[PDB]
Point group: C3
Chain length 562, copies 3
């Protein structure tokens, strides 16, 4: 590795075509790609740096309801009138989610003692020996005891040490008690912060009347909601959900750009139902949970249990805030360049397809409209230089009677040449700038061939004739003796390379002979690549040998050039 | 398709330039790109596979406070001394967030009954008929009834069935009761898990003194905090926030690499305020909520209601853990390759710009410093081979008096040729390796042109002259008769392709005549691509025709080659 | 900017190689890349648009337990038998997480008053002057007062205004009270929604027996779990965790494709422990908290405090739903194209490596197996066209005695030429299609050189000789006088370009002389690029000058061509 090898810059080589069709196609594709990427950049705001948000939600529910119920306690039933305020139908969860009671089922006066279990469907027992001591299972309000007692006249149930009077499995009461909760109100206060952009805002703005209510079109940016409207917008019925509660969800979409020329950051409110739309025959249809209020009277602990059915609103906050940024632009321009190669790849594909040489056969005479596209063939000739790898089996042969050249890339295995065939190939056209300057063996149709002198193993390659059919030989013409066998022209060609060589040298003869071989190939096999592997016939070879003979040893043959 | 077509590998063709400037530019750009990508890989740790974390947080607040307040109950007021412990100013939320009370406002002795409403601002009523029965609205503590009663001497308000004595709307008491909460302490225990890397850890380490407090510099990794310092770090005031509570937020950043040579995983604590910086005249400035304690005495249900103002800390855990991975390296090396094309594209752009041929006119003589950059023009000649598509309208004309060639890609519409002009173009230089080998019509300035014999529609194309101005003809020279009209040289050129054709053939004459046309084009239009579409003048054409005449039919004209 | 310069389409230029090895390598690499991308597309389902989920969880725990404990109140101890039901060991959290009590430690009969503090380890005090009034610290149940009192006979402690009888710091009681909670049951109801795909579903399906239990293999899709099995699957022990509680975690993985031909969406349940694996000597091992139950009797407020140790389950729901989408396919096909260049880059690298020209020296004779790979050199000759930039220092020299050409890109600084050396370079081969056509100064070894006439500063460049060693001159041959000094051939070469120039012109001589210089270069420096910068010796120069002399002024020298 030398210093001169470090400064070498390597550059691709191209060809330029002046055509209206390809130019129009190229510019159309470039313009539409530019339009697409610009539209995407302007729509999606890819020039902006986007960042997620940090949210904080606070909720306040308001409303009152009345209830009238035949309540039981100590075996005494009586109609009681009660009121439910905010502190009674809500629990202090203090988060994004909040709860609202719509129906309840309570049992009061409970105290820890022995009592019979309420006989449910299939829990009857009229045998004191059937029960088992200290056995617990789900759907059981207590621990079982070996004894037995009657729950009522003509009723027999197992004893249990638990809270008594034990709660009895009841379905939810329909119509609900707190169906009036369809008229309650909510207030949702959301503060959102983009830290990276250093922006903070809130859904509430100055001047809003607090006696407002959210409507989809009338008053959209009023954070106060009505619990009936949330179900009305979707199509659900609150009076049916109240009996067996169900989960609801609110979504607050924040999408805005923190640019001075376009600064609108407002929340969009949406609603969704997360629970399954349950019906009769469903398995687990309702949302419910139990909770107790403890107390004591006359030195004895007691509780009041409440199974509460009610909705649950799961607030969901998601968004992204964008602001102008310069590096994202550069990142996008870096990506567009790969897309910009469509015209190049498409037009190259069109050329390579239309230069197949099969279209001239059938599709062109059939259609009769795509004729001038044959022009593309010319482009291929000015774009693709086809070659072939050199190998010892590579040979070329030309016959004067035929117009084309025959390549041979196969071993002989003793067979005589010109009896084996190979893929045809056409000869190239001569550079006209220089052209303007001006008895016998069985395998010879020429009559003038000679047998080979090489060994019996390698001589079959030398078996050849100038003409494949009989009638004429190449060496009988005059151009042959003018070009090849002219000693003066060959001496001139040798002087053109080495002008100071001596013409009286003894070993000069062979030198001339070598040139004569090339002087044949260039006549027939024009290309130097095709001429290095060309093989002369026997007649021309032995003519040249008799004009330029060797005496010391036997003649050699086709030596591999490398 | 063919088998020989499947093994064909297609390779791009390039040119190699030995220049110090381009080499230095190339290597500079390569080195700086390498430096940038290596710096990015080392800084961002892109060689690592990253994974998010799974967190579990637990909190414990500790501290005590005293309160002295004139409490009311049953119309009896008296000064009472009370204590607030951990179980009193907190609620069992059991999550990431937790709550602390800083101010309260309570009403005790409530019972469900009829009572008057407390007259708020604008809720006075001195008319029994004005009220409506069975009406509910927000900001109302109960259901209204048609009756009316006096709340006090000289006071008249509406009756309601609700909890009595009904709570009266008051502002938050200032100074706050639990301002002492600025000295309470917190303990935060966070456990994090990276499942994919299988790494579990915790913020607490062995040996930390439990009698520590968080400081930004003194003792950073002490998870115990002080509620006053959290506000003091930001610049807030706890005494002003205690009156109307506000939300606070703690952030715990985990960023660490699970590599054996670099293993430091420690949390970073940060603070932020999620609520708005509220002040006077704001609408909804305070965090608060209501909760109730139920009980009963002498067989009657009662409750104690508490409107609580306090802060709410929202703990936020975000992080990512990285560990060494081999495939990410490969993915990054795969991406660098597209970036590495900067030198190529930039230098090619420089060449294409400096080879515009306009710089030689104005900018070079003006600046007088970018002269040697004209060298780049040569590179263009060795890089871009320009061509033109063949079409029937395509024609080339050359006049001996002018030095350049005239292209014509436009229809004639009956106009005589050489009266219409087209874009100039220079002739290519001859391959010197071969060059070293050695009355009249109105539209002719040459005096030797002849009229055309083609039809009247298509003959105007043949109208031409050798010279555009008068004075001389081409056929008067000697090189003309040496090259074209020499029967021997043309016969030799025919033998060079088909050495066995007979010179006695009657149809050979026309053959020779065809060659003569090419022998003119190659003399003037050197390139074969240009020579195939060249057009001879009339004088030379008819000279060639008289030397090689036809008798059977009329002569044809310029046939399209393909 | 011309119009014709807008329709110019630029196309890369290539060379096509016919080789079995490179074709096989190309197709192998293409097929394996195709296989890889297809396998990735089928495995990762990249043909689908994926979307995250929106989840809603609801829990219900069931089970009962009994406790027998020597409970204390008012200095009276007695054995008490209690029961714990669903409302007694759970708290209404109503979220993803839920809590279960496994151990408790309670203190009842508390009332706000003055009492002594329980003497802990190191909190003794036998001196009334040591205490301080109005001092609060953590680990203290109340505010300290200056007075002192005895907690018991032979015990002295500080007085405090707080809840009395004050709770005493105790360790967790082992064995736990609610170890029976290993046999409780849970029910988890999860509803998921994919909005974009518009698909709602639930883990529960019709027909499941509600008397089921989750098993990893037997009954996987039974959402009922047993709290002992959750620990048993991992390897933990519930009885050891129940004393000092710890956090557990459930994970629900939804991975499914919403395609009609493949529609299976079922949850996978997994378990994990989020808390640390704690043992003896650890610092903060347990999850616990405190909560109180308030009441009043005989007109006096009271509370019962409970320190609860228990587990906390943190349900975690993550997943992604996929459905078929057409644009993602196009996006993937767009990405594969960059990958497809492997064969091209690899084979070009192989060619550029094997064409280094160093392999022929050492590695080939050593290995003796990679000989035919030398063939690749030929490809390089058909691919890379090496050139050199023109500059005023660039010169070329050739000596007939040597076979190669010497490049010189260095300033002389007054030194005589042919005494300075430069990098060698071989001469290119002649186009054989045209080749078939047919006293003295100190620094001259030729004997025929002349001194220079240029100024003393610039004449050293002209100092040169044809032969580097003595014995022969070039101008003594016959080819020299046949090519260069032949007035007729030069006149013909001039007529070949400008056929109408007059041979009687006085200024024609110099013209011929100029041509003679070129007629030397093409003889020795075959390329036109190398010939434009070639420099003649003195002997040939002055021979040409004597055959074509100038009389008016002194002869100039080598002028820069551009
Ligand atoms: N769901 C709600 N529906 C209607 N009005 C509400 C609602 N929630 C709060 N408000 C009213 O809007 C205003 C803002 O409530 P905010 O909590 O900020 O003040 P407040 O004095 O603490 O409320 P409160 O009436 O409970 O004392 C109050 O006048 C309040 O009466
Ligand atoms: N905010 C806090 N400030 C100061 N010390 C604390 C705080 N929280 C907990 N601790 C102390 O740090 C240690 C760890 O608390 P941990 O809950 O693990 O044990 P503990 O004995 O159950 O707590 P305790 O009985 O005091 O309620 C305890 O000694 C505890 O007193
Ligand atoms: N952990 C659980 N273990 C066993 N069974 C349960 C469990 N949770 C609920 N169930 C049973 O499965 C069914 C579904 O419970 P669901 O809440 O939907 O109805 P429910 O009548 O309100 O339940 P219950 O009144 O017994 O509390 C019920 O029969 C219920 O008894
Ligand atoms: C919405 O569903 C509720 C059920 O909760 C419907 O309530 C019934 O309405 C019909 C009127 O068609 C009355 O005849 C019934 O008396 C109502 N049920 C009860 C229990 O009172 C309600 O009708 C539905 N919405 C509308 C607009 O009808
Ligand atoms: C922080 O804000 C509080 C208000 O809550 C300030 O409290 C007052 O401090 C001034 C001293 O400048 C006293 O004169 C007032 O008596 C304080 N207010 C009350 C109600 O007592 C406090 O001053 C502020 N911080 C500092 C350092 O002054
Ligand atoms: C799981 O851990 C528990 C500890 O909570 C072990 O309980 C002990 O089990 C051994 C049996 O090897 C008994 O001798 C002890 O009496 C048990 N401890 C108590 C307090 O009763 C339990 O053994 C462990 N699991 C197994 C399978 O042994
Ligand atoms: N293309 C081609 N080259 C040949 C042929 N015959 C000989 N050559 C070359 O000519 C040389 C051998 O010629 P030859 O008559 O045997 O003389 P020798 O070397 O003294 O035996 C070698 O350099 C061969 O490469 C032929 O038939 N075709
Ligand atoms: N480039 C060029 N080719 C010509 C011109 N004239 C004739 N040719 C070719 O010469 C042939 C016609 O020659 P022509 O004298 O008409 O003989 P004809 O074919 O017997 O009528 C055709 O192959 C033409 O393509 C010309 O003016 N310029
Ligand atoms: N490559 C090369 N070109 C030369 C050389 N000498 C002269 N030229 C060219 O020939 C012209 C000068 O020839 P010269 O004998 O000085 O005649 P002058 O122009 O009347 O002075 C210029 O155009 C030179 O570029 C030489 O030695 N080598
Ligand atoms: C001549 O030899 C016949 C041409 C053979 C080349 C065939 C090229 C086929 C190209 C098809 C590509 C279509 C575009 C598909 C994009 C997804
Ligand atoms: C000769 O014909 C004049 C040259 C015309 C080509 C002009 C090319 C302009 C290229 C500008 C590119 C600047 C870099 C922009 C990167 C974002
Ligand atoms: C001839 O002058 C010698 C050839 C010099 C070229 C050396 C090219 C080395 C290429 C190494 C690339 C290996 C693959 C690495 C992939 C990560
Ligand atoms: C605000 O709107 C409400 C409801 O629409 C109505 O009372 C009135 O238009 C406004 N009230 C006040 C107080 O501004
Ligand atoms: C630990 O630090 C604390 C507070 O700084 C101090 O009491 C002492 O330096 C250490 N205490 C113990 C018990 O190690
Ligand atoms: C369902 O399964 C349970 C438990 O395996 C068992 O009682 C029985 O196989 C089925 N019971 C019912 C009621 O379908
Ligand atoms: Zn023969
Ligand atoms: Zn023959
Ligand atoms: Zn004329
Ligand atoms: Zn003329
Ligand atoms: Zn000399
Ligand atoms: Zn000499």
């Amino acid at each position: 590795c030398s210093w001169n090898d470090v400064f070498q810059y390597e550059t691709n080589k191209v060809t330029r075509i002046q055509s209206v069709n390809y130019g129009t196609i190229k510019w159309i594709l470039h313009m539409t790609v530019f339009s697409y990427v610009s539209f995407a950049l302007m729509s999606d705001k890819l020039y902006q740096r986007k960042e997620p948000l940090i949210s904080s939600v606070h909720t306040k529910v308001k409303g009152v309801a009345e209830v009238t119920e035949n309540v039981t306690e100590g075996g005494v039933t009586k109609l009681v009138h009660g009121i439910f305020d905010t502190a009674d139908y809500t629990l202090p969860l203090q988060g994004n989610s909040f709860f609202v009671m719509t129906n309840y089922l309570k049992s009061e006066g409970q105290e820890q003692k022995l009592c019979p279990e309420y006989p449910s469907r299939g829990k009857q027992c009229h045998s004191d020996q059937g029960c088992i001591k200290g056995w617990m299972d789900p759907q059981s309000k207590g621990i079982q005891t070996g004894r037995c007692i009657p729950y009522d006249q003509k009723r027999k149930t197992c004893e249990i040490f638990a809270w008594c009077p034990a709660e009895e499995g009841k379905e939810a009461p329909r119509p609900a008690l707190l169906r009036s909760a369809e008229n309650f109100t909510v207030l949702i206060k959301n503060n959102i912060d983009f830290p990276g952009h250093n922006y903070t805002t809130r859904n509430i703005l100055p001047g809003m009347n607090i006696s407002c209510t959210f409507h989809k079109t009338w008053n959209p940016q009023c954070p106060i909601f009505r619990l009936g409207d949330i179900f009305q917008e979707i199509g659900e019925n609150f009076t049916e959900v109240a009996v067996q509660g169900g989960i609801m969800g609110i979504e607050i979409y924040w999408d805005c750009n923190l640019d001075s020329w376009s600064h609108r950051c407002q929340p969009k409110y949406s609603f969704r139902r997360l629970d399954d739309k349950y019906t009769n025959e469903s398995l687990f249809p309702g949302y419910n949970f139990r909770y107790a209020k403890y107390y004591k009277e006359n030195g004895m602990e007691k509780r009041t249990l409440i199974k509460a059915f009610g909705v649950r609103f799961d607030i969901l906050v998601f968004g992204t805030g964008g602001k102008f940024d310069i590096i994202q632009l550069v990142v996008y321009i870096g990506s567009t360049l790969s897309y910009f190669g469509l015209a190049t790849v498409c037009i190259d594909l069109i050329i390579n397809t239309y230069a197949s040489t099969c279209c001239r056969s059938r599709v062109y005479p059939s259609c009769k409209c795509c004729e001038p596209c044959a022009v593309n063939e010319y482009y291929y000739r000015k774009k693709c230089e086809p070659i072939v790898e050199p190998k010892p089996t590579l040979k070329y042969v030309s016959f004067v009677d035929e117009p084309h050249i025959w390549m041979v890339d196969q071993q002989l295995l003793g067979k005589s040449l010109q009896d084996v065939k190979g893929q045809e190939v056409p000869r190239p056209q001569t550079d006209f700038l220089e052209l303007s300057r001006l008895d016998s063996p069985d395998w010879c149709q020429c009559g003038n061939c000679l047998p080979s002198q090489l060994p019996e193993n390698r001589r079959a390659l030398e078996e050849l004739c100038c003409r494949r059919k009989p009638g004429q030989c190449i060496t009988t013409s005059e151009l042959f003796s003018k070009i090849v066998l002219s000693r003066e022209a060959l001496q001139l060609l040798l002087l053109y390379q080495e002008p100071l060589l001596a013409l009286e040298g003894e070993a000069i003869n062979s030198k001339l002979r070598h040139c004569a071989y090339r002087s044949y190939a260039t006549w027939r096999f024009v290309s130097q690549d095709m001429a290095d592997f060309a093989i002369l016939p026997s007649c021309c070879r032995w003519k040249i040998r008799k004009e330029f003979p060797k005496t010391q040893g036997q003649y050699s043959g086709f030596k591999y050039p490398y």
